[PDB]
Amino acid sequence: IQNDFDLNTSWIMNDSEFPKINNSGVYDNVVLDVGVDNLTVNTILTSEFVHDAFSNDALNVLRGMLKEWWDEALKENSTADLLVNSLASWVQNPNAKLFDGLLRYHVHNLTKKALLQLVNEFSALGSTIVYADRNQILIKTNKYSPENCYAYSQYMMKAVRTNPMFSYLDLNIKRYWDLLIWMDKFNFSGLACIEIEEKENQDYTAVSQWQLKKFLSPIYQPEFEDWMMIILDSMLKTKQSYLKLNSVENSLNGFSHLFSKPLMKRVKKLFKNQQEFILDPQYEADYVIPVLPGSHLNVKNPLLELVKSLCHVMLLSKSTILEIRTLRKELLKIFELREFAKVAEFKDPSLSLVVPDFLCEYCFFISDIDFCKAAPESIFSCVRCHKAFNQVLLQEHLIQKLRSDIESYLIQDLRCSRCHKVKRDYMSAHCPCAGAWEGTLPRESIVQKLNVFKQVAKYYGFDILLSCIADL
Amino acid sequence: SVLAAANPIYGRYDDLKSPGDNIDFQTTILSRFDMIFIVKDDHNEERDISIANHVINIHTGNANAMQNQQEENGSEISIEKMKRYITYCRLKCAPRLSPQAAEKLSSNFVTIRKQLLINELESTERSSIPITIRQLEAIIRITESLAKLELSPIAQERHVDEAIRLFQASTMDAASQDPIGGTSLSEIRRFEQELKRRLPIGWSTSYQTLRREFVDTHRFSQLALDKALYALEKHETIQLRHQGQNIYRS
Amino acid sequence: RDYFKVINASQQQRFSYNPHKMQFIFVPNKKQNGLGGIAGFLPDIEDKVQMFLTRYYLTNDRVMRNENFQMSITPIKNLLGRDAQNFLLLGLLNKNFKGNWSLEDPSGSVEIDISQTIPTQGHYYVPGCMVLVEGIYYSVGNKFHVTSMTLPPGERREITLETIGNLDLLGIHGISNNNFIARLDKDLKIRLHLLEKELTDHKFVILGANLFLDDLKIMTALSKILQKLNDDPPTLLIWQGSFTSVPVFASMSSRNISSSTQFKNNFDALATLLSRFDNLTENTTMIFIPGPNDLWGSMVSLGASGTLPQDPIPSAFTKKINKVCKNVVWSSNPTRIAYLSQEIVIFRDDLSGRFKRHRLEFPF
Amino acid sequence: KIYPKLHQMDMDKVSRVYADLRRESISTGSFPITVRHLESILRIAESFAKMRLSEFVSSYDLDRAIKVVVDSFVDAQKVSVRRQLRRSFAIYTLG
Ligand SMILES: [Zn+2]
Ligand SMILES: [Zn+2]
């Protein structure tokens, strides 16, 4: 029977994407970075009508087997430890025998439920989840000083571990954040201390990871870097002054008063020089807008995107909106534009192409890799272990993703335009009510997806993927 | 011909209140009319953006040019030419029906009559909007007008389909617009309790199995189908996919 | 021999059917008029709406052209107002959302009573098949009590052709397009007479299905076959079935040979084996038809049944066979060749098991 | 004598303001808002242009008109949400 094509099997085969939580903004409270490990094993060990359910008896037997393996590995058995490590890779891999996609989907669903339950448990106490993933969790702490969060963090992690459903989890704390500007996984900057020491002021280091910097003109990226450094310094200074004094927070309010006039004068000077030397042939090199995979915006004046990004980075405050808006209007008055104009609206200068459930053989690390937003020298190597990846594997995975995408588009359902009820007949012109059928999966979405596959394959050396395109 | 613009009681239609006490007209007066359009106001912000765009454009500083282009590209014609065309078509042609169209009209009328009866026996009050033989005459005259528009001396399936579509729009917007008006609710809460307990989030089950189980129990088919489709109408926990076979709990 | 063509499902001309004009209508191909440089192969949304309409229209015309039928069938929607009267109707057969047996027509759908059905033997009554139903309507419920059931009869080539004269569907001599419609029957008899002679010299031989190019036994048998064959090369040689015993898909381990590389390797040895049968390579053209679990399908189907208009073998994995042999053509799983006076179609899949597992059951 | 003319007005600002007023309103409160209020905004701007004996509407008059309309809508709500709406609508009438 397994040779036949069935819809539910098709949908459980290709249901491989994993959700995540991202809450952008500027935080003055301390934030701790933690890592979550042994998630799948804890998910498995912890916990007629439905036809898609996996067999209960086999699930119970597997849970008991895993439990005895855990117990034996606790009593100094290296082989049991290796088996426990390789269990997840065995589960994911279809090449292994006794493999059922239903069991894989069951494990994935249970992992989803366990992760949401863990997020809820973290939210039970005083906490704010900034970022979520299968490997990384960022939690906003109520306090203001990293030195004061030692016992708090230890008690919180101890209570988390003592929870019966989270007994087997492994929790590690990596970094402590003093002042963070978080908008995306690949785009953030802030001050961090590795670990809090005693009787001594901690070491603070500044990080600056901004893919948006790449899409600037070659001559304005130094200006962007310098002004980002200056604004971070100003925010740190105002937070320190407010702390010395003792949905609005005076920790950051009034920080833009430090660098307003120099910024305006510099913007005027940049505008004058750009106006003067834009049409010169020998100066045409530094005004060339770079092209990168995933780039789709076509725009002309570089200073406009410079100021747009420099304003959008400030606008993430969510508590000092009015001051930022006044500054932005004043900046836009230098040009002959208007406050709410379309051309003065910031957008994402890149698209996304993510491959889920990417596996490393040497380290058994599972993570979703982004082919567009991620920087180079990270697609080709694993994150934890610095081992190079196989390339034809990357090409094959991209091809499989593309083919599954095309199949999913081709097997989509039909929905009525006026009332969103679904089509329930094989031949019929339209809905019984008014309205014409439309597809659940629009055409332009898949067209853009194929466009970005083309761009990605063109950027690097990807020949079999190009052949896959050519056959279409 | 009679064209009337009227407002319901309490201003807005107030869908929460029953249609019966939203329209003060008697059954006799509505029967003479044959196209009744309920123009509801909606907020989705995309139609609102488009409408604001159109209004600010139709401001006299802009539209006075754009409409001119509609007389230069041949997309739209002037008013007086339309007047001459309508008077000429009224004087010249008068189409006629064909037997296949007659059979299709008969079957469609039987279907809508049956649907009205099935709504009435459920709601157990008389429908505030009736369906009678005058509506059959209405569809016939709509088809006649559609054929008259193109001067064709006969009316065929092409016009009949459009006429039936317009009539179905103008009857489903008003008459069958939530005929229940919002065993009682006791079985509803019992029904919602069991599927929540028995069926977790992420899986799916066949419609036939659920119907079999809840017809074997006291719920029966009439209560379950309405309950299932309203839980669908809640549109926050249960989704339909792969025709009516898969009941997906999002 | 010249004046014969082999065509794939990708380049077949599109012709719609109109129920109101009772005539086939040419449809422009998306590639010829469109750009096609970005994505031109993606069909539009209404295509799946109209596909079943087209199939039903063609079946309706075929049925109504029958000699016996001049009694007349009745559309489904015209069955509401009558009861205790016998009728006749046809349409799609499927299972409704509830799980009962139903017949679907462009007018509408009804239910089926099967408790006393006597079907015409010799047919595989399968969901998705046009069927002729004779029964008695009953308005007490909605059950069309069936008493007999038979598939529609078929027609020969000449009688169906003459209804459109001889239309240029598989146009080799001439084609039709948007501007004009073309027909030809003058050279048909001439080419028939030409084919009647020297036909024994123009032989074409086909092999079995699923010749896996990984095992030694198949290679040895193939070498013996080529040893017998190289002396007298035929006109066409066809290999059908999969060329690899395991579907190719994602390999999670880089320690061993990649499955794609293995698939490339398997055809490379075939080029070497062609080196010792030069007469066959020189005089006979070669045809390859993809199997169920070849490269593109198994990538998402993993060896199970998938899309029927299957893509040809990718060029990147056949860069040596094209250079050794002088005439090799890869086509889709359904492929059509045009001879002088013959139409030949080749189709490789599983049929008997499919029709055995999905046979409808008749109480008796 | 004076008839103002309206050429250089912000399309997106007024469109977004009207969309925002369509949001909230009956969807959260009770006061009804329709397309006629957009024409009211335009007429108020024209009147403000008339006040100075000018034939062309300037941006300042549009700002004054939008301020008047948004204030009139704001101060007709319950005290539970008045401050929240007031801080929500502070970006269009920034001045
Ligand atoms: Zn690794
Ligand atoms: Zn509809």
Side-chain angles (χ1 to χ4, degrees), chain A residues 416-421 430-437:
Chain A
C416 171
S417 299
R418 302 286 211 282
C419 46
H420 279 170
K421 298 209 297 285
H430 59 74
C431 187
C433 168
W437 299 120

Side-chain angles (χ1 to χ4, degrees), chain C residues 5-23:
Chain C
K5 284 297 296 182
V6 56
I7 200 66
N8 62 7
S10 177
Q11 293 287 355
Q12 180 92 3
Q13 294 279 29
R14 275 197 73 180
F15 263 78
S16 175
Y17 183 84
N18 189 289
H20 301 298
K21 321 157 88 161
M22 300 66 67
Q23 69 202 20

Side-chain angles (χ1 to χ4, degrees), chain A residues 360 363 365 382 385:
Chain A
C360 174
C363 195
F365 191 63
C382 174
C385 65

Side-chain angles (χ1 to χ4, degrees), chain A residues 1 3-5 92-93 95 359 361-362 392-393 396 399-400 403-404 407 409 412 414 424-428 439 443 446-447 450-451 467-468 471-472, chain C residues 38 41-45 48-49 52-53 92 94 97 104-106 249-255 258 296 299-300 304-305 307 311 314 316 354 357-358:
Chain A
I1 302 311
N3 303 288
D4 297 346
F5 170 86
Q92 306 325 304
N93 187 10
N95 197 48
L359 184 142
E361 304 151 61
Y362 308 95
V392 71
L393 292 194
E396 189 279 333
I399 289 163
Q400 178 162 64
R403 290 307 296 218
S404 295
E407 181 66 18
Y409 160 74
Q412 79 177 284
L414 289 181
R424 313 214 311 154
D425 43 14
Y426 293 104
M427 78 211 88
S428 282
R443 188 193 188 84
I446 74 185
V447 159
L450 269 70
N451 272 133
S467 85
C468 169
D471 268 344
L472 313 179
Chain C
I38 176 169
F41 64 99
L42 294 167
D44 311 313
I45 320 183
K48 85 172 306 186
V49 193
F52 281 116
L53 265 64
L92 263 182
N94 76 101
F97 74 100
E104 188 163 317
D105 210 60
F249 60 92
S251 63
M252 291 275 257
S253 174
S254 62
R255 308 286 171 75
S258 302
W296 295 102
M299 193 75 68
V300 290
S305 195
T307 61
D311 282 309
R354 203 65 60 89
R357 283 196 310 279
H358 292 184

Side-chain angles (χ1 to χ4, degrees), chain C residues 9 11-18 23-30 32 50-51 53-55 57-58 164 166-171 174-183:
Chain C
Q11 293 287 355
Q12 180 92 3
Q13 294 279 29
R14 275 197 73 180
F15 263 78
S16 175
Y17 183 84
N18 189 289
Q23 69 202 20
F24 297 84
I25 301 177
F26 174 90
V27 177
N29 191 7
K30 308 178 72 70
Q32 290 191 329
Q50 293 179 356
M51 75 174 321
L53 265 64
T54 295
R55 197 178 300 173
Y57 290 155
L58 296 170
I164 43 176
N166 205 296
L167 195 41
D168 300 10
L169 291 176
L170 283 73
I175 65 169
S176 304
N177 43 37
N178 56 5
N179 194 55
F180 61 88
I181 181 162
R183 293 181 183 174

